[model samples]
Target: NVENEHVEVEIEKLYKFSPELVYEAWTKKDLLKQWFMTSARTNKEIEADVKEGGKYRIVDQQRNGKVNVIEGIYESLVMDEYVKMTIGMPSETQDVIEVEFFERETGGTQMLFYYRSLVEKERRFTNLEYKQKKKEYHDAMVHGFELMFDKMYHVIETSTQQ
Candidate 1:
């Protein structure tokens, strides 16, 4: 909740995949497009320069025929280990996202995802309706990412088997 200040979301998941494959799932533009923004059936353009100080952009067409664009810059990147970026759409403030990957002894990867939003004090204290909406938005965003990760996991698992 943004009752007093900024809100942070953290999620940890273990996958039966190597850290290198998991890192590539996030950094490679083609792999990202396959599972990140739109459905695998949808045609979306994804461009990424995945390195420290690099920039990336994604353009997706909504079901309602509206086009959505998200642009971001990489703040830090460590091969097969971690990535941090600032991202948002044109109408919103940029939020920070950090992902860390660790190799597990059982022969898999463990991923830690963190998202932090920079909400203005005025916005947080505005009105009850706005506050409630904000919380709903945050919740949905987290769930959406979890769903995306599920897709990523499936893609990795299937590809490795083939």
Candidate 2:
């Protein structure tokens, strides 16, 4: 049995695009679906209020014909700045995720995410397996995100020159 009452994980990402564009990538379903999922699955549907206490959800269908749903409530949101939310699992437990975006000198963005989970011991053990899977999944996902951010950065760079 695990004795710790808390668990936390952090992910740091660099995006070669403006903070505005990076923030939009997170809020916009079309942009998000490109790198947020396991496959090139479209974001079939997205609903976000983008305010404190507001609700958010995303429904996606994978290339392998699998459906996944995620829903959550925003605890805090600051445009082009930060977001803190509690994402609900299908089970009774919820996970808290806090994300902050920063601007780099080269007109890019650096994103930091902190995720915390509070759950029963049995559930936590099961989640450990899921987390292990995520170790691989997240690496691939971030790679895709970086690729997309590069495309967006080129567009921004060309626009500035014109």
Candidate 3:
């Protein structure tokens, strides 16, 4: 963690599904809404253009009656191989999210997910202490994505069955 200038959340997941299908689970608005923003079978309106230079919006109506709107622009898209998007707080420098899918020879697909952005270390903590805190934040991010991928898996698998 020497280069603590930016916090990056990177994780890879191997699925027993094909690369094309996995990619669709991400790019398709219907599939995305079924699992991406809310729990299973929850009603959420997600509209996506899903092309390079296009923007998408997600209306996540939470159970608490708060409607969280997530809007992002597609930075790049390369068919089933890769896709990148800009996401972060508005009126601030946005971070990037990139996902690449590779087909394994034996079978299935491997997805590499990465998100890295700038964050100035706190003035109170020492260099090492700040790095420790940064790592803790990273772990929290990783676990959150893990849940998302788990939900995505359920969506893909169930969709394939139908």
Candidate 4:
């Protein structure tokens, strides 16, 4: 187990919006669906319960016409402060994704995001292949998560702009 170390993603983003607005962008179903998977067609749907211990399913319809889904359950949904959820839809490899929001001194919000794995811990440590596979998936997820923020930016910013 050379690469046995479980891979997780730790990334942060700064936003030009209020912490509460950012929080709304994250938890509100329509807002999330509008920007969550901008690369995919806009016809996809998002089904989620914004309360703690509820479920969130983001069904993304790709260009190929097939759908890819990302599912999660909210462990905690603090108002404009933080959110913690077990996602991918278990192992430390079904990881709890925590999204924290902090209001900056100057203005806007600082969003800190973390994903500790949700692919299956056992398989991650079982072999290099699985570890790499997890990496691939995690990388995609992170990229997916990263790029969508831009879409969110447009949705929020453009609406605010002329």
Candidate 5:
């Protein structure tokens, strides 16, 4: 069983978008609302100040009509390169999320995502179960990002075409 040290999740992916475009998607409220939430339909509001020490808040209405809120503060930002934020949900403590964008020689952008939570624990699961849970969490996060990035790419493509 994994003890309560800090839980860290790392994900890397190559996307068919420029680093500048991806970085703008991360920092701009209009672009962010296109993909950041669970779904575009569920996203009710997004408020952001995309600078160091600035704050952002996103509100989503769930399928069951419940409201889910996420708020965060930007810790640092290096335009088209990296962003670091402290993010939290309604009842949970804040966690650190960092994203790095690297330009690829073959075109597109390579993204590295890191998220760390200090208070998460395995909570009595067996070793095998704990491992499965960890993998499930990682997979879910990556899948969500894949969907969001796909949407963002489509938005960028459509906007540029017009």
Candidate 6:
């Protein structure tokens, strides 16, 4: 949180998958459509250049069909390690979103998301409240992702297991 006119949020997820797979899920448009922007009614249409100084955008449709377009440019990228970028709002103001991925001992991967918003004081409070609501929404979203991954894992194991 920033004084007077800013908002910040952090989200972390641990997946029973490899760092490379997790990174791809985020950077790839198709994979992102599966789980990103879980609160939206329609799946996201994502375009990611995914390199330093590249561009990215996600268009999410709300339940009532309202569209939210989030656009950004990559500030940094380090393969499966981390990605840092600046996201622009509908108003064209920019915020920073940094994502980090780490390999876990359980053959899993951990992803952390940090977002810094540039907005006025009132807007920041509103954004904070919205984030809280989104967190609640994310609880269910996580369950959905888990189910998706369970199926994914089954397919992978069946195809490759010895």
For each candidate, what is the lDDT? 0.81, 0.66, 0.81, 0.76, 0.79, 0.65
lDDT, candidate 6, at 50:
71
Model 1 Cα lDDT, one tens digit per residue, 1-162? 245445677999998789999999989887877777655566467788888888888888787877767788888899999999887742457788899999999977999999987555454355776577668768987898899899988878877888
Per-residue lDDT of 100 in model 6: 94
RMSD score of candidate 2 (Å) = 5.4
- Single out the weakest 10-residue window by summed lDDT for candidate 1: 118-127
Per-model tally of clashing residue pairs:
0, 0, 0, 8, 0, 0
Summarize candidate 4's per-residue lDDT along 73-129 as a digit string, tens digits.
888889999989876553323566788999999879999988775454454355676
Per-residue error for 133 in candidate 4, Å, reads: 5.1
Question: Where in model 5 is the C-alpha error above 4 Å?
Answer: 1-5, 89-91, 122-124
Which stretches of model 1 miss by more than 4 angstroms?
1-5, 89-91, 119-131
What's the distance in Å from true for residue 42, model 2?
4.6
Cα lDDT tens digits, model 3, 1-162, are 344377898889999899999999889888888776555456567778899888888777767787777778888888889989877534456767899999998768999999887665665678789788878877877887899999899899998899
Evaluated at residue 149, the lDDT of candidate 5 is 68
Q: RMSD for each model, in Å, please?
A: 3.2, 5.4, 3.2, 3.9, 3.0, 6.0
Q: List the residue pairs that clash in candidate 5.
A: none
**lDDT at residue 132 of model 2 (Cα atoms):** 62
Give the alpha carbon lDDT tens digit for every residue of 13-62 in model 5.
78777899888888988778877764567888889989998989999888
Across 86-146, the per-residue lDDT of candidate 6 in tens digits comes to 8673334787778899999986788787776554443535767766655655565455445
Please give, for residues 38-116, the per-residue lDDT of candidate 2 as tens digits.
Answer: 2244667777666788887778776697777878888877898887888784335777878899999885789887777
Q: Please tell me which model should have the higher lDDT, number 1 or number 6.
A: 1
- Number of clashes found in candidate 2: 0
